Amino acid sequence: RDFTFDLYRALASAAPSQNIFFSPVSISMSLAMLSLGAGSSTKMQILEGLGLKSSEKELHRGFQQLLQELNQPRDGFQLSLGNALFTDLVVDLQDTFVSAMKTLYLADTFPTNFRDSAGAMKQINDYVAKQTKGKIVDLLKNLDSNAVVIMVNYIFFKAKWETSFNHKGTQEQDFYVTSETVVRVPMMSREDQYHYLLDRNLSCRVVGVPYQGNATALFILPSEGKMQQVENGLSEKTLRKWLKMFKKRQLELYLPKFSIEGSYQLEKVLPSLGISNVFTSHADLSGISNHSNIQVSEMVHKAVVEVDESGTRAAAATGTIFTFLNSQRLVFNRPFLMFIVDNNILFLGKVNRP
Amino acid sequence: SRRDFTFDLYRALASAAPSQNIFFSPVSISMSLAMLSLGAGSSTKMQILEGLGLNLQKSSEKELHRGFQQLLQELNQPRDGFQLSLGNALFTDLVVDLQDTFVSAMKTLYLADTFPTNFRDSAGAMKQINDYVAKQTKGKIVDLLKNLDSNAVVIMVNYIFFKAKWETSFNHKGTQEQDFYVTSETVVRVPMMSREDQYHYLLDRNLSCRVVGVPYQGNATALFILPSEGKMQQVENGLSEKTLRKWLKMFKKRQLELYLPKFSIEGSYQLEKVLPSLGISNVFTSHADLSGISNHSNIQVSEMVHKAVVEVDESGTRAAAATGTIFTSQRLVFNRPFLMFIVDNNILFLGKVNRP
Amino acid sequence: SRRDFTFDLYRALASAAPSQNIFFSPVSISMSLAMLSLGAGSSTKMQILEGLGLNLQKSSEKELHRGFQQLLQELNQPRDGFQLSLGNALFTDLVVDLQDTFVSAMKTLYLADTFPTNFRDSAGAMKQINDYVAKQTKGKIVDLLKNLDSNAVVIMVNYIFFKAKWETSFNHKGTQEQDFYVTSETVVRVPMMSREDQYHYLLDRNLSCRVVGVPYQGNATALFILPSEGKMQQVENGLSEKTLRKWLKMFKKRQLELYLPKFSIEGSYQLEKVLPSLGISNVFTSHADLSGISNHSNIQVSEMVHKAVVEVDESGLNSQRLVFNRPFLMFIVDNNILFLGKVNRP
């Protein structure tokens, strides 16, 4: 039972041969926020799902602390997170719950006339459009006239690498989406020391590329035909191992310049992972409203990330070395997994097609 | 009478929407039109240039465009606490092929883009247009279009929003809720700002209105016009560039107790429905000569949408200088419908505030 | 409903690869199977014949094979514009003794070769198979197989491709990049061709899709199917030969502004993984009866590989506008359904 990774597999299984990209920490946060107004067996699943009792008072203080940091402009690594709840006109909001939202999670709660589907969707999309300064302007594509409460979570990310990729080393190359399907993509490159590691167990190679700061981008390349195998091995433990075997190594790195995003209706997947009550009529959200017919109708999550050459410090030119074969080369030209960690797993995804 | 683009447009717009606020950017709208004339010909182009009141006698078309290009650059020119943000974009139906000359000129001389668009799918075209402006304005304007006809061939969009700090803030504790007489029968409550200071002032006995100038941090200045009781129509009919130039010469400093409402205003217009009455019609019809943008025989501007937004609050660069700090005034309170001008060489904005 | 090889196979292949492009040749595959039935016996042979939906009630096996053989001779008839290249070959392990009645019929009536192969040497066998297809296809398909098990007993390979130009070309001057909506969330940029003209058109309110025919420089015609928003699955479920006959009936000319992505597409399938679901299974298991090819104990088709390839581009009055910028279906017909496919992403 490893929520983050069970969520990944659940998503990859529901959408074979497609990119996958979500924010683990961000989703758990949304789920914690939600527990703040859930009761009995409903709050139980959420907490059990997250991986957590009673000391929950600290659970929220932790996230609150985390939010303030992220939303703190730390130039060269600016993360943009957002949460918001839209509740139908008939669900009366508890001031204790609304205040908690604003205070702990900096999230607003907006009454909404869900009987007016087109209007409600525009309101939700306009809100996120303003909040994200125009970066995400069409979060929702459809909306049901029977919605009671819609939860939205969005997160945009783009930091500068510690060191830029070669200013002239980006060339178009082949990327094998499959043994049959082949596409051209802009391929960045830079030779240097890198936290490398080979996992003969899961059969894959892992390389770490440092962002300007404390976050690290982890790129996993499964060996021929072993993506499924690696996916099944993904786990908190496995991750702790990798960070423990990482040793700097001279490396001719080849990595695609790409943009990836993911948008999911979490209510369609979380149930299969144990968090089901809250999404059903049997839900207990009495902490939000003592209205009987309350339940999360949709929990939409969207994460977006862009990877390019831009680094803080220009790349150091090798030059003619004189020592006692050929440096190790690693080109990401087959589907690969991507992690972005900074104490937490900020992001997790699969680049099936740049 | 005489032709005066800006004020004639103001009057056209106000006449079409009585009892309502009116707000637009004269300079932005005329820039959009000049840009358009770049791919227009014969009477279509001329209708535009003359309609704009350009001095063709004195300057070549080339010098005029250079004028606008230079002006555009200065506006997008980043200025401390005087950030002006305007944009232009042209959306053309799939079937119209564009002259690379026009598209390029547009992009490099007017910083305006052009986007092929499938107008047969109106909902999709409207979303594509609104999403585009949303991103360009960083979320400031997200729903520029509310409707869209499926017969469109080309739609032009022009938007601008501005917010600059006053040269001097209003009293930190001087904002109180007050009555505002929309009419003599209707009264609303609005946040009223205040500050006693030396202001450029002037009383116009001809049009019958008081005009006060409030400087922005920079070169721009806001002009507020308070018509005498029952004289709004009279002042509206009197507006003209002559009147404005005169007002600027006659201005005289004066100690004043100024009460000005805090407010936000905006205006969105389908200029294709008004400009024709001002002499600019060909371009909006099937007999339009837009051979410079496309050889396509049916090309015509179906819609030209303009949106301008402005916010007025207490914020200024420096703080108000407390009066009577050692001890040793006429009061002007804008609590009735008033006119507003924002000037910086050009008339950046012009509007009427009926209800703050 | 009622058995339908062509479309039951399509659904079979679609369901196995959600969100991916599908592209195969129904005529080519039914041919390979008929050919294989020539060396099959009892239930193994009957599963194939019944699987192909053949009418065993009115015709004899002899007549059925004659029909197929005649059809093959036609498909292979030269003719500038709509050139079609078809190929079939069987590779049998060294130990599987071959009945010359089978080998000879296979070669003379179906133009197919049978090659003894040392499947104990995987790399060798795979190279010989790929080398062969590469030569047979004139360099069109040079790497048919990517892997091969040393336990293989018999590998069957079928390939097909064509060279044709549209009757009425698409103008390059009308090709511009556009937004293709893979999903209502995923959108990509693709090179769209366009051309206003009169085209066979039809609107199927039943399946809820629009169909347009685009004639090739010959006798063949491309069929492009566009499901209405969110109706792809619905259209897939309703596809059938009868339904196709219906479209060729209801087809009426119409002025249209057609926007069609320019794309190339090919498909490769391990038919042994899917045909069983359609009732054709014994031939791929140890319980196979292929006494017609050999009276050797452990004979069975280990892999039945199929590859079909195609390219779609210009070459090699306010009329209704129809733009293919959502996942669409593609047919290539000419007396027979030569190619069937689904473009999920150009």
From Swiss-Prot, chain B:
Q: List the disulfide bonds.
A: none
Explain what the record says happens when changing residue 246 to E. Answer: Does not change the rate of thrombin or activated protein C/F5 inhibition in the presence or absence of heparin. Slightly reduces the rate of thrombin inhibition in the presence of heparin
- Do you know which SUPFAM superfamilies this protein is assigned to? Serpins
Under Pfam families, the record lists: Serpin
Tissue expression per record: Predominantly expressed in the epithelium of seminal vesicles. Expressed in the proximal tubular epithelium of the kidney. Expressed in the superficial and more differentiated epidermal keratinocytes of the skin. Expressed in megakaryocytes and platelets. Expressed poorly in kidney tumor cells compared to non tumor kidney tissues. Expressed in spermatozoa. Present in very high concentration in seminal plasma. Present in high concentration in plasma, synovial and Graaf follicle fluids. Present in low concentration in breast milk and in amniotic fluids.
Single GO cellular component annotation?
Answer: extracellular exosome
- Predominantly, its location class is secreted
Chain positions carrying an annotated carbohydrate = 206, 219, 295
GO BP field: fusion of sperm to egg plasma membrane involved in single fertilization; lipid transport; negative regulation of hydrolase activity; spermatogenesis
Q: Per UniProt, what does mutating residue 205 to E do?
A: Does not change the rate of thrombin or activated protein C/F5 inhibition in the presence or absence of heparin. Strongly reduces the rate of thrombin inhibition in the presence of heparin
Recorded consequence of changing residue 328 to R: Increases inhibition of activated protein C/F5 and factor XI/F11 activities. Decreases inhibition of thrombin activity
Q: What regulation of activity is recorded for this protein?
A: Its inhibitory activity is greatly enhanced in the presence of glycosaminoglycans, heparin, thrombomodulin and phospholipids vesicles.
Superkingdom field: Eukaryota
Its recorded name reads Plasma serine protease inhibitor
Q: State the organism of origin.
A: Homo sapiens
| Gene for this chain | SERPINA5
